[PDB]
Paper text:
Mutations in dysferlin, the first protein linked with the cell membrane repair mechanism, causes a group of muscular dystrophies called dysferlinopathies. Dysferlin, a member of the ferlin protein family, is a type II anchored membrane protein with a single C terminal helix buried in the membrane. Dysferlin is not a part of the dystrophin-glycoprotein complex, but its function is linked with calcium-activated membrane repair caused by fusing aggregated intracellular vesicles with the sarcolemma at the site of injury. One DysF domain is inserted into the other DysF domain, by gene duplication, forming an inner DysF domain and a two part (N terminal and C terminal) outer DysF domain.
A single dataset was collected in a different space group P212121 (orthorhombic) to 2.2 Å. The crystal packing is almost the same in the two forms, but the distortions of the perfect cube in the orthorhombic structure means the monomers of the crystallographic trimer in the cubic crystals are no longer identical. This leads to some of the flexible regions (eg residues 965-671) being more visible in some chains with the orthorhombic data. The structure is highly conserved between independent copies in the crystals. The crystallographic trimer of the P213 crystal superimposes onto the trimer in the P212121 asymmetric unit with an RMSD Calpha of 0.89 Å over 326 residues of the trimer. The four individual chains from the two assymetric units superimpose no worse than 0.79 Å Calpha RMSD over 108 residues for any pair. The biggest variation between dysferlin models is between 965 and 971 and 1018 and 1021. These are also the regions with the highest temperature (B) factors in dysferlin, the regions with the largest RMS between NMR models in myoferlin, as can be seen from the CING database, and the regions that differ most between dysferlin and myoferlin. The trimer (with 9 phosphates) is predicted to be the stable assembly by PDBePISA. We have no evidence from gel filtration or NMR spectroscopy (data not shown) for the existence of a trimer, nor is there any likely way to invoke a trimer in vivo.
Residue numbers in the entry: 943 to 1051
Write the structure that this text describes.
């Protein structure tokens, strides 16, 4: 009767490559949207008092991403990481990432 709070947790799975190379897995390769590291999606836990509403993590194909959910970029000095992502793969693109989301909630009473 008091309602609930809702929060969609968002994390990004990251891959890199050398031009002419292949897309490859890394260690802890998960970051937030700005590229700062975070736990791998499957290790993420609700804060105390919260519960998952979605049973599974999902990736949203309506955003500007390809058919597998990836968006693409390259690192342009002076920067040390990609800043601008695009939906379409091209041979000179060296980074890609995929956005995973999951809804959790907290009942207010």
């Amino acid at each position: 009767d008091a309602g609930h709070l809702s929060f969609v947790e968002e994390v990004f799975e990251n891959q890199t490559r050398l031009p002419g190379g292949q897309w490859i897995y890394m260690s802890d390769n998960y970051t937030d949207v700005n590229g700062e590291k975070v736990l791998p999606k499957d290790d993420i836990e609700c804060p105390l008092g919260w519960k998952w509403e979605d049973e599974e993590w999902s990736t949203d194909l309506n955003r500007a991403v390809d058919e597998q959910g990836w968006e693409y970029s390259i690192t342009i000095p002076p920067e040390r990481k990609p800043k601008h992502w695009v939906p379409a793969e091209k041979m000179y693109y060296t980074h890609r990432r995929r956005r995973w989301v999951r809804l959790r909630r907290r009942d207010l009473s």
